[PDB]
Fold Na(+)/H(+) antiporter NhaA.
Amino acid sequence: ASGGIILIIAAALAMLMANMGATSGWYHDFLETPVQLRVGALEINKNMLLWINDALMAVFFLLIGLEVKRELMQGSLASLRQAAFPVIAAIGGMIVPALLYLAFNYSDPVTREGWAIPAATDIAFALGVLALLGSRVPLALKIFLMALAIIDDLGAIVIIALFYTSDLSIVSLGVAAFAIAVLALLNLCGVRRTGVYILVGAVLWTAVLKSGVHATLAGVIVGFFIPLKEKHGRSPAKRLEHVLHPWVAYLILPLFAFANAGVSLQGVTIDGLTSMLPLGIIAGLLIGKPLGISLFCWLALRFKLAHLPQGTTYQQIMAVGILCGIGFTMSIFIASLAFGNVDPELINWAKLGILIGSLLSAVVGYSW
Amino acid sequence: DASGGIILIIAAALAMLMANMGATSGWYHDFLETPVQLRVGALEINKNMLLWINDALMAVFFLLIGLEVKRELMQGSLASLRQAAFPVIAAIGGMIVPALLYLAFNYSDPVTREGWAIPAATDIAFALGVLALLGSRVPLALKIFLMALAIIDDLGAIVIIALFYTSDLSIVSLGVAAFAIAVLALLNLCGVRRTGVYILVGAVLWTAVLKSGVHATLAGVIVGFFIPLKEKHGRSPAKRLEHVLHPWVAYLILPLFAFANAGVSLQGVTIDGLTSMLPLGIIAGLLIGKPLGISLFCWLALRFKLAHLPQGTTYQQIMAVGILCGIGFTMSIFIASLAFGNVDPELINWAKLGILIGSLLSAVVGYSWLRAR
């Protein structure tokens, strides 16, 4: 559970940096620093936070691409029947948190763009809370929760990168398509040097630099093509996932939390927190997650299209539904995509709703 | 095992093809001179494309060197404890004679006098690549004497350019550079064995000195110096990293640096141009300065009992390494690109011609004569 504590400390310092007279200012101005890259005629203008997030979420989603692949062929999602329960819980864990959010935000066209914010679940945080009491919690839950949180996060990133994301340039797609093809020919020819895939993946990542959500999905694509075969008792993907895990839990996620979870608290009142944007997120996380998860799981069980993990009791299914209300880093990233190039206070009110919702979901889910 | 030297030759041929057929001469030249501006707040870095590539490639190449040096200096053939001082005395000859021979031509020209360290370089990979071409039963110490000898010349050349012939770094750069070593020194004392943590900190050292190619190059050897070489549990971080790092240098870093820096348009190149003081000085300093300098210092050192002799020497085999040390190639091209920055652009082009003709003459003479003995 070590990864979860170091993440909260990182968020604690950020709130501290953002709310002290001496630090707040240098903290805000650093993150808002403009970074202009100019390559001949090409020109990429992103502030500092954008450049950092695009790199951090790249490697983070590279690890998820490996974990999706290992669970899709060797774990929970391997068969179509075992994957019935995590998938059903995920759709409910997405539509109900979004419906609640939309119920509050439908009348404002500017805020109803962030409907996917309370659909994300911080895997590292939620696993930390489970591992905090994980002396003898059922093994199936920790893999169920992992598979559950991943499909929503990836699906959200997918649907954000299909519709709501802006189109790329013609040249950028040609290189992206060619880079993916080289990753395919590398896999079909059976090369097992992990660094070569990372090399081709770097070209992929660079071509779509202007789109932060595409540079993110570039990580998932690379993680899919790292070979998983076990020749001579060695696997490139299993080895790479083993290398990335401590770096993601102890550096990538803490840095992402430190650079994004700091909002000023000055002037924040209960009436402000009950406006449509933060409360829609709070209600989406604190209520929408355990509602949609329990409802669909209960609907699954009764209507024969179901399964059940070993040692489940079905009260522990709705329990982790509450723990899935911890959006945290993943919801913050979604909010940064939904609320870029709009009014700067939209992202600030969003983080406040996420932090309150996630903190309530963590404490409430800890009582069970 | 000679595959690295051959791939390094194909890449230079391709580069020469790119820079001479009209269909590609435009793209190759324009791409390498493409300007690249990074503006971080008020900070700003302007370097053409080729400089960014070389500062990144030569940082990785010299990280591998720092690993090899520390091994060969703390538990290797060169070693500390002043035992194998035979290459150290030979290296001073591999730098003094090529420099004095070069300066004999270019003394009257204050501009070209700056490139006196160009023939002092030696392309390690290609020189051993031409030795591995014959390396069925060549003395092991010979190759690891060549490899130990070539580094002192290349390291010393980079050091002198970094200590005198380089431009200034701001105090903010120097400060972070010094703090980046303090955390490296804290890591080394505390016994941290994660290779990545040393590379993370190294990345900070590299970017802090990014305004200077030599310092960016010096940052590679320093990271390779501070990585623990200890053999705890039969696993060494330096040896593990070098075994991963070595194939990428021979197959990707060096052929890329060659493909990017060994392409020179040959239109109008006459025989009068190659006999100019600048290229001929590089030709002579390599084709003659290396063999005459290396052999004369081993001769001067052996007779006066200050020296040593590797097992299976014959001393005529040394003179084959000498003519083989006239292989400047990539290493001299890098030195040339540093000594001839922010001056007339044709200087680097004429320097490159003197390097390839001098190395080719050294490779052929070095091969055809060592194949006789």
About this structure: Chain B is about 70% helix and 5% strand.
